Design a protein around this ligand. Structure first.
Ligand SMILES: CC(=O)N[C@H]1[C@@H](O[C@@H]2O[C@H](C[C@@H](O)[C@H]3O[C@@H](n4ccc(=O)[nH]c4=O)[C@H](O)[C@@H]3O)[C@H](O)[C@H](O)[C@H]2NC(=O)/C=C/CCCCCCCCC(C)C)O[C@H](CO)[C@@H](O)[C@@H]1O
Ligand SMILES: CC(=O)N[C@H]1[C@@H](O[C@@H]2O[C@H](C[C@@H](O)[C@H]3O[C@@H](n4ccc(=O)[nH]c4=O)[C@H](O)[C@@H]3O)[C@H](O)[C@H](O)[C@H]2NC(=O)/C=C/CCCCCCCCC(C)C)O[C@H](CO)[C@@H](O)[C@@H]1O
Ligand SMILES: CCCCCCCCO[C@@H]1O[C@H](CO)[C@@H](O)[C@H](O)[C@H]1O
Ligand SMILES: CCCCCCCCO[C@@H]1O[C@H](CO)[C@@H](O)[C@H](O)[C@H]1O
Ligand SMILES: CCCCCCCCCCCCCCCC(=O)O
Ligand SMILES: CCCCCCCCCCCCCCCC(=O)O
Ligand SMILES: CCCCCCCCCCCCCCCC(=O)O
Ligand SMILES: CCCCCCCCCCCCCCCC(=O)O
Lengths: 307, 307
């Protein structure tokens, strides 16, 4: 009854603290190791984020099996990023090719097995109980590729300022945790592990950044966001929960297209939009705070789209 | 049934967005007004925080009557701060006298009326259902004064860096909202109004601060934290939920006492402890992030102390 949900809440809160402890303790141990590889701050810090998620989620896999596809996707997107950052020490079309392979294997898992429904919950209709479920069948795979690539690139573009991607993703992952518990899905310990792991990293990533994510990180988290929403039948919530991610890709699409259509004219001071505000006179910290506060308000708005 | 809690969650989420909209829109309107009074950034910005709380909570007073004592206490502590900051443009023992009067009227409300129980829930015992309730009767009033003054001064000492008090209090107020809903207390719209109001202010208070709280703010929020916990029978949770507030007063008590006991020796580089880390080489933003992440982890630990 209430005990079922209580034990789940207690196991999820525990997953957050477990991943927070791992991530916070690995950072001072792995930070000189990453700086030795480099020799403006050491990159490839996404390995700390992933290491923490993998360790925590491995204890929950026997009890919560729906974690496995989510874990495989973030680790899969983390592979492309690990290879990308390895080239960076020792491409846009190559990155899109790598992202295309992982999305395909995930599309295969969703259509062949019957663990989760392919339908999409419409936001302000009446929740999972009442509501309305969008289905297109034939267009399921093209729609998956388009939103998964959009989310992954959107998250990658967000990783431009200290604490930016981390702060925004903590709030997105917190929303998925509250929803995964309340709606009784099976991915709350991994969504929670991402919250804990990112809170640990944020201590060392906040201005002035001691470490940098990724690419190794940013692609992994972008996979997590898209995979979780697909595991919960909520891809239609990504434009609202991840409006920051959406506005980051969209500002680049508008800048690059408009620049070429004109004589090199600019629609923004610089793209992605976080560079635009900086050039407007906004502090690195202002941009990080405004983007996070906006995400928080929109996560609450999204939640009201489940009643 | 579930509808009762659902409507409460929807009314509370609404209170957050309402207070966020008021606070975010008042700031660019009241910021030149406060700078005109001053002529390193304009102070007395706590009036924006309070204005937003009062407007939002006034719509919920007929449905949620338990808001009235909480509202009266923060407005009461906001009065002392408004007078303090007025003197600042045109004291420690005078501040302690003002705080003593408001605490007394609140002590009178708690003992004379039977709206709430005087007992204190012990953290890791078994929650409100099972658990253990600490009672001392005669010592209720002295214990109230000691924790209320400690909390109020602790919150006041936290307001030293850009976004510091705001970030930490958002997390403390979020915890009280989740708890006030789940445990069916009657103060969730005001605890939520504080979350919304502070999220609006944080946009303009984050480094480099456009406005400053208080004193007008800091004392008001310190009253809110102590009053909410008393309305919920959770004062014993303030050392864990507000460990940052506790460590801020405690570091001053240790520095001031040790300095006098010795030949002017220092136990910390500077007190409160936020100045200590800055002098250790920590960024203004690092201190704000570390203190907020710690509060978040401890709020989760505190929650596990309700099962
Ligand atoms: C338009 C486009 O596709 N490129 C983007 C896009 O390109 C990616 O650049 C990334 C670099 C970015 O991580 C830099 O930002 C800095 N950084 C990072 C974290 C942090 O916490 N703090 C910090 O300062 C730090 O200097 C770091 O080198 C990376 O090369 C991607 O491969 C690249 N993706 C693609 O274009 C695809 O994202 C960038 C960052 O937002 C944008 O500047 C850039 O315009
Ligand atoms: C020991 C003690 O009691 N005093 C404290 C205590 O004193 C209070 O000082 C406050 C001032 C503080 O608000 C300053 O911090 C700055 N500030 C504020 C917000 C912000 O967002 N950013 C920012 O930079 C900005 O310069 C501002 O003048 C105030 O005078 C209280 O009356 C005072 N309380 C008591 O001693 C009682 O708190 C201080 C701030 O933490 C400590 O420096 C000081 O040591
Ligand atoms: C501190 C964060 C706690 C996460 C809140 C998750 C809410 C889980 O709470 C559950 O929600 C269900 C409806 O959603 C109800 O049917 C259950 O009775 C209730 O226990
Ligand atoms: C997004 C934040 C939502 C706040 C979560 C509050 C949890 C309210 O959820 C309620 O909790 C009670 C036990 O606590 C249960 O008995 C109820 O059935 C459940 O609806
Ligand atoms: C209030 C909480 C504060 C916690 C204090 C922890 C201090 C640890 C400092 C670690 C420094 C490591 C330097 C690596 C670069
Ligand atoms: C850096 C600024 C971040 C501010 C943190 C805001 C925390 C508020 C909690 C809202 C979580 C969103 C889930 C709603 C359901
Ligand atoms: C992604 C969300 C960004 C929201 C953009 C809002 C821009 C408003 C800027 C207000 C500037 C007011 C200056 C007062 C000092
Ligand atoms: C500036 C950094 C703030 C980070 C925001 C962390 C949000 C996590 C949400 C935890 C809320 C605590 C309530 C637990 C029950």
């Amino acid at each position: 009854e209430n005990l079922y949900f209580q034990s789940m809440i207690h196991e999820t809160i525990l997953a957050i603290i477990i991943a927070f402890a791992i991530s916070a303790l690995l950072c001072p141990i792995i930070i000189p190791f990453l700086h030795k590889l480099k020799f403006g701050t050491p990159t490839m810090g996404g390995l700390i984020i992933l290491s923490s998620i993998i360790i925590t989620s491995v204890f929950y896999i026997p009890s919560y099996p729906k974690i496995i596809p989510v874990l495989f996707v973030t680790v899969g997107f983390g592979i492309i990023g690990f290879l990308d950052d390895y080239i960076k020490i020792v491409k846009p079309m190559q990155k899109l090719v790598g992202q295309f392979i992982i999305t395909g294997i995930f599309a295969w898992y969703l259509l062949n097995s019957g663990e989760v429904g392919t339908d999409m919950l419409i936001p302000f209709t009446g929740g999972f109980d009442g509501g309305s479920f969008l289905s297109l069948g034939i267009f399921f795979v093209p729609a998956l590729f388009f939103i998964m690539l959009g989310t992954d690139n959107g998250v990658n573009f967000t990783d431009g300022l200290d604490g930016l991607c981390t702060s925004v993703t903590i709030l997105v992952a917190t929303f998925l945790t509250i929803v995964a518990i309340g709606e009784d899905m099976g991915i709350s310990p991994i969504t929670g592990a991402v919250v804990g792991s990112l809170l640990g990293f944020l201590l060392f990533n906040v201005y002035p950044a001691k470490v940098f994510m990724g690419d190794t990180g940013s692609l992994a988290l972008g996979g997590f966001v898209a995979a979780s929403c697909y595991m919960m039948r909520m891809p239609l919530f990504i434009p609202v929960i991840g409006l920051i991610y959406l506005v980051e890709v969209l500002s680049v699409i508008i800048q690059v297209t408009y620049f070429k259509r004109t004589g090199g004219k600019r629609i923004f001071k610089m793209a992605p939009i976080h560079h635009h505000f900086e050039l407007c006179g906004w502090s690195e910290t202002r941009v990080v705070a405004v983007f996070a506060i906006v995400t928080a308000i929109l996560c609450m708005v999204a939640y009201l789209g489940l009643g």
